[PDB]
């Protein structure tokens, strides 16, 4: 005979905290326990008695209860934390359940941080020179990586690599290898690796001298 | 579970795992929150009602399967809805475990079948085979199961694979050879069930009279 | 440091009794047991101690062992016995298999029986009349059925539904059902299904007059 | 189980679920007949071997996991089987249950990683962030498997789909980002798993001497 009531909509990116309230005449006077629910699966229990949390429930979600208002609190969201969440009261009476909150984990344009990696000395005892760009926790998904060599541009001589969109961030991140044999490696000074994407304003390239520290 | 279609004026079975912890029963209209039932406590054997229901909500349980059921009756179309079991411990108002929902959707177009009999012929073959049936028609949606004499008899049975007719409904056959020597004195009753229309029936195949 | 030979090779039809021998010098001196074995699969125990039947395995299966010559029996063999059989033999020494056989169970050409159906007297009184049409286990799947009212032809007023193969004897069968009105059902007498199929030597009429014994 | 592919020379164990019962393990090259290998009896904790393997099956057992392995040594390509767990009563001379096979093929074209560090730059951003890694080059077939510090470090990681260059070998890398400041104290080692060659390497990744 009374009613729960929830924003419809919670909307953060990756590593912030979402706040989700749960409103009703008088809340604070009773007991309120938080569910999650994915799409066509059944709600699972991750807060109860305001703030408690059931075994395996990670220790980002926490709670309160005080005044009109309980708070489902989750800090560093992740991704995979996208999913409907409903508070639920108990007065005694009447079991009652707010109308729930979709969470959306926003992923928005990130520009990748760009790392070059020399080959080993073990590596190069062997004949075989590998030079190692990485582009880390980027999106979205389009990228170019042209490598350069003593200013000269690179063709055929270069493999890549990418990941499946990261569960906490939702984030790519791609490597990009050139093979040379030792002899070329020993031949140059300047290995350079140049990246375009969409969260730089314009390509940025690393690079460093062989033999250097 | 998954998904079950249901004529308006059936009703629903929702069936429990079942100390000092509460069943509940909780649904979910599609795109909506969640909405309890009603509830049944097993140390006590008592159950507990949700006034929007009506008298609609009936709430058993079965001390030796340790199972308790809701039945939902005189469904409506906006009992369309997922149904949930939940349970949670006695007094502490939350619920640790959700099992898996059902999906029941209360539809119009539900038809239970007429069953007719396909009775074997008086010119069967004397100590040959004889063939018999059931037609089971005019239903909506699938399925239909059939079985014949509670399931005892499987061996020379064929049932058909549906055909959707140019009314829209469905219709089947499940016949039987038999030895035609049986004829007169051994008994065959197709067990015909269609779950949407809450239509269970039992019809005798016998050579007809003349 | 014996060996055990098993024909390759045994082929039945549904419903034949196969036989699969074990030969090895001496072997009636012996427990043997015997394994089926589908493609994929890990082997099953059929029998042991010659003839004894484990739990669950259908009673057509039994066997024998005297002399230089151990053999597995099935009676009415159904499609799904078609696998591979090991005899295994036992001196208390060694543990030794026979080669295998492989059981095929063949599916060649068979007519349908062919049975009609008039509609139910019940079934009138609501005003429709289904005739129905049955190929019985037949093979292989291709049938032809055209129904006749008083002789004519009839074209669109019937639907076809066929089984998948049978799992005991790998045949098909096939209802056709014919739909008119009571009225028109009341109009003619003959009510004919011709049946044409690879097995027959020519197509088969089973017929039927209207209010008759 | 399922399939594993194993290089001339490697081993391949078999396990095994371990009263009066003997376990067997038999093997089944494609297209042929049922092959003893050995056995072992939980109850007296005694092997049996098969001549026909000289001295390349090893048989050993675990009381606390009741498990019983079956080791075969110093493959080859005529190793190519199935492999199967099974298990009858004590002296009877049959087997009642079959546990799933395992098909073993033997390859002459498998080849074990070579494992390099990606060693964090030094010029990395003070009190930002550092990326290492392991490039794992040159094996045959897939998969390998890496972990950081036996799995104890996970966030950060990204293990690269493998990329088949064009010697027909695979190459991945596996890497990191960590704090910078963290380069002077903390340890970082991967964990390199090629199950076909039975390679098993850790590397210790640190930045390069000046």
């Known amino acids: 005979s009374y009613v729960l009531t929830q924003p419809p909509s919670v909307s953060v990116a990756p590593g912030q905290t979402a706040s989700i309230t749960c409103?009703?005449?008088?809340?604070?006077?009773?007991?309120?326990?938080?569910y999650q629910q994915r799409p066509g699966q059944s709600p699972v229990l991750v807060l109860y008695q305001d703030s408690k949390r059931p075994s395996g429930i990670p220790e980002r979600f926490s709670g309160s209860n005080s005044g009109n208002t309980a708070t489902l609190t989750i800090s560093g969201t992740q991704a995979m934390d996208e999913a409907d969440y409903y508070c639920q009261a108990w007065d005694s009476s009447a079991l009652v359940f707010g109308g729930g909150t979709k969470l959306t984990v926003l992923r928005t344009v990130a520009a990748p941080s760009v790392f070059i990696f020399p080959p080993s000395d073990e590596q190069l005892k062997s004949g075989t020179a590998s030079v190692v760009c990485l582009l880390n926790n980027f999106y979205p998904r389009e990228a170019k990586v042209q490598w350069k060599v003593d200013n000269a541009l690179q063709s055929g001589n270069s493999q890549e690599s990418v990941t499946e969109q990261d569960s906490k961030d939702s984030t790519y991140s791609l490597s990009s290898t050139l093979t040379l044999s030792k002899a070329d490696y020993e031949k140059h000074k300047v290995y350079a690796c140049e990246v375009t994407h969409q969260g730089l304003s314009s390509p940025v390239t690393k690079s460093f001298n062989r033999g250097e520290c | 579970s998954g998904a079950e279609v249901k004529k308006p004026g059936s009703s629903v079975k929702v069936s429990?795992?079942?100390?000092?912890?509460?069943?509940?029963?909780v649904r979910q209209a599609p795109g909506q929150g969640l909405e309890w039932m009603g509830g049944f406590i097993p140390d006590f054997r008592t159950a507990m009602y949700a006034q929007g229901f009506q008298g609609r909500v009936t709430i058993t349980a079965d001390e030796s399967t340790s199972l308790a059921y809701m039945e939902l009756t005189n469904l409506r179309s906006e009992d369309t809805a997922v149904?949930?079991?939940?349970?949670?411990?006695?007094?502490?108002?939350?619920?640790?475990?959700?099992?898996?929902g059902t999906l029941v959707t209360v539809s119009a177009s539900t038809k239970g079948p007429s069953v007719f009999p396909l009775a074997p012929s008086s010119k069967s073959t004397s100590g040959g085979t004889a063939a018999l049936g059931c037609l089971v028609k005019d239903y909506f949606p699938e399925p239909v199961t059939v079985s014949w004499n509670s399931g005892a008899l499987t061996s020379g049975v064929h049932t058909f694979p549906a055909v959707l007719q140019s009314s829209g409904l469905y219709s089947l056959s499940s016949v039987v050879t038999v030895p035609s020597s049986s004829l007169g004195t051994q008994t065959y009753i197709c067990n015909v069930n269609h779950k949407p229309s809450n239509t269970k029936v039992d019809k005798r195949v016998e050579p007809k009279s003349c | 440091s014996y060996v055990l030979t098993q024909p390759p090779s045994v082929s039945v039809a549904p419903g034949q009794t196969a036989s699969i021998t074990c030969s090895g010098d001496?072997?009636?001196?012996?427990?043997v047991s015997w394994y089926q074995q589908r493609p994929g699969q890990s082997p099953v125990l059929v029998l042991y101690q010659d003839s004894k039947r484990p739990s669950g395995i259908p009673e057509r299966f039994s066997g024998s062992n005297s002399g230089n010559t151990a053999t597995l029996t099935i009676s009415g063999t159904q499609a799904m016995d078609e696998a591979d059989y090991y005899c295994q033999a036992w001196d208390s020494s060694a543990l030794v298999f026979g080669g295998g056989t492989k059981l095929t169970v063949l599916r060649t050409v068979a007519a349908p029986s062919v049975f009609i159906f008039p509609p139910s007297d019940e079934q009138l009184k609501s005003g429709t009349a289904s005739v129905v049409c049955l190929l019985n286990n037949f093979y292989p799947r291709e049938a032809k059925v055209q129904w006749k009212v008083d002789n004519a032809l009839q074209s669109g007023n019937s639907q076809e539904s066929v089984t998948e193969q049978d799992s005991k004897d790998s045949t098909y069968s096939l209802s056709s059902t014919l739909t008119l009105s009571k009225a028109d059902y009341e109009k003619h007498k003959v009510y004919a299904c011709e049946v044409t199929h690879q097995g027959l030597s020519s197509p088969v009429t089973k017929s039927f007059n209207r209010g008759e014994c | 189980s399922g399939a594993e592919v194993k290089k001339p020379g490697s081993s391949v164990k078999v396990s095994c679920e371990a009263?009066?019962?003997?376990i067997t393990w038999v093997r089944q090259a494609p297209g042929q007949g049922l092959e003893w290998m050995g056995g072992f009896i939980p109850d007296f904790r005694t092997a049996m071997y098969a001549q026909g393997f000289q001295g390349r099956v090893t048989i050993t057992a675990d009381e606390s996991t009741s498990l019983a392995y079956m080791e075969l040594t110093n493959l080859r390509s005529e190793d190519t089987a199935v492999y199967y767990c099974?298990?009858?009563?004590?002296?009877?001379?049959?087997?009642?249950?079959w546990g799933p096979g395992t098909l073993v093929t033997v390859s002459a074209s498998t080849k074990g990683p070579s494992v390099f560090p990606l060693a964090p730059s030094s010029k990395s951003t003070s009190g930002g962030t550092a990326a290492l890694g392991c490039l794992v080059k040159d094996y045959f077939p897939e998969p390998v498997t890496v972990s950081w510090n036996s799995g104890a470090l996970t966030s950060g990681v990204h293990t690269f789909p493998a990329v088949l260059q064009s010697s027909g070998l695979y190459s991945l890398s596996s890497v990191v980002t960590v704090p910078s400041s963290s380069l002077g104290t903390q340890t970082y080692i991967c964990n390199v798993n090629h199950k076909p060659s039975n390679t098993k390497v850790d590397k210790r990744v640190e930045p390069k001497s000046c």
């Open positions: 009263s009066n019962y003997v």
């Open positions: 001496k072997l009636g001196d012996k427990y």
């Open positions: 099974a298990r009858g009563p004590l002296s009877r001379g049959y087997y009642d249950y």
